[PDB]
Design a binder for these strands. Sequence first.
RNA 1: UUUUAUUU
Length: 167
Amino acid sequence: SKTNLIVNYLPQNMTQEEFRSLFGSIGEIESCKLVRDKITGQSLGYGFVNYIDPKDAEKAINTLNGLRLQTKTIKVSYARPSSASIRDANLYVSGLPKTMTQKELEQLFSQYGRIITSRILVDQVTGVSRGVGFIRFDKRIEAEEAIKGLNGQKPSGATEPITVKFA
RNA sequence: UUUUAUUU
């Protein structure tokens, strides 16, 4: 992209100043905002940082992505243009082979469009896949095509069919 | 039904 970044998985405790302070260390910022609920005013867990120099936006991703703050591992990536087309493109998937890895889940779903995030939920005990997860596409239309194409289908080698629906 | 919460 260029100069605008979206930072996800920010801890609920991180303030607007600590946010600007953390990213301001990379280089000059034209603007940045820790997004908060319109009514409660509480952090929504993500924010945006727009640098003056695109080289610093690149440095921010290279140096800050994966930084562990409190219980989170933040993600820093390029913010795609604010368009209604990228909204509601999150899918909840279930019935996946428990042997399936995130790499395979994304290869399966990538046929339908650019994947923003993907995750396989694991048992909060032994760490065994639950065969359930999420896939967030770039465009809502791509998620629509993935539902039509994969909902109720059996992914190569799978003995059981998977379920795909909007989160 | 997520590192609850990826477009201010």
